[PDB]
Amino acid sequence: GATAKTINDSVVTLIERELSGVKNLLYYSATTDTSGTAEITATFKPGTD
Amino acid sequence: YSEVDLSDYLVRNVVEELKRVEGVGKVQSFGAEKAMRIWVDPNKLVSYGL
Amino acid sequence: ISTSMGSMYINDFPNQGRMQQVIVQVEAKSRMQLKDILNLKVMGSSGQL
């Protein structure tokens, strides 16, 4: 029941700030739509379990 | 810019981007971001029954 | 006694596009000496404080 902005300001960035600290990380990205779901993908460097 | 402004900027735009550098293990910021502070006076509270 | 010295975090607010904490704490002048804490008043059964 929330707009994309609300889920981006209150959920995506908060979770992303900690996600930035994981080991062996190549990059991270996040996406939010009007459907009410936020999806974050974290790609790690080659050879990481 | 005062100390609070510098610390807020460091937390907002530096700490996260400074940990994107390879080899950076831990980042410890000796500062805090801005916040809304409500400094309450108990004497004034009791005078209103709150 | 519990809310006379420490800080209390309630919720977040939007400051210039970022979620920032809201903290309610007693004024500094009223949390410095034992006299300040010992001057706190509560209502009893009677109207007196």
Kindly state whether C25 is in contact with chain B, defined as any CB-CB distance less than 8 angstroms: yes
On whether any CB of chain B is under 8 Å from the CB of C13, the answer is: yes
Q: Which residue, among A4, A8, A30, A3, has the nearest Cα to A19 in the 3D structure? A: A30
Rounded to 5 degrees, φ, ψ at C18 are -130, 145
Measured between CB atoms, which of C22, C30, C43 is closest to B41?
C30
- Kindly list the residues from chain B whose CB atom is less than 8 angstroms away from the CB atom of residue C27: 39-42
Name the β-bridge partners of B50. none
Q: Are B42 and C30 in contact (CB under 8 A)?
A: yes
Q: Which two tokens stand for residue A40?
A: 């974050």
Experimental method: cryo-EM
Whether residue A2 lies within 8 A of chain C, CB to CB, comes out as: no
Distance CA C38, CA C29 (A): 14
Residue B44 touches chain A, beta carbons under 8 Å: no
Which chain B positions have a beta carbon within 8 Å of A21's beta carbon?
19
C42: left (phi over 0), alpha (psi -120 to 50) or beta: beta
Taking the C-alpha atoms of residue C10 and residue B37, their distance in angstroms, rounded to an integer, is: 11
Residue B30 tokens, joined: 């000796």
Strands A38-44 and B36-40: unpaired
Nearest chain A residue (CA) to B24: A21
Contacts of C37 (CB under 8 A, 6+ apart): C1, C4, C5, C31
- Cβ atoms of B9 and C15 closer than 8 Å: no
Task: Measure the CA–CA gap between C29 and C33, rounded to whole angstroms.
Answer: 9
Of the candidates A48, A45, A16, the residue with the CA atom closest to the CA atom of residue A29:
A16
Q: 3-state SS of B12-48?
A: HHHHHHHCCCCCCCCCCCCCCCCCEEEEECHHHHHHC
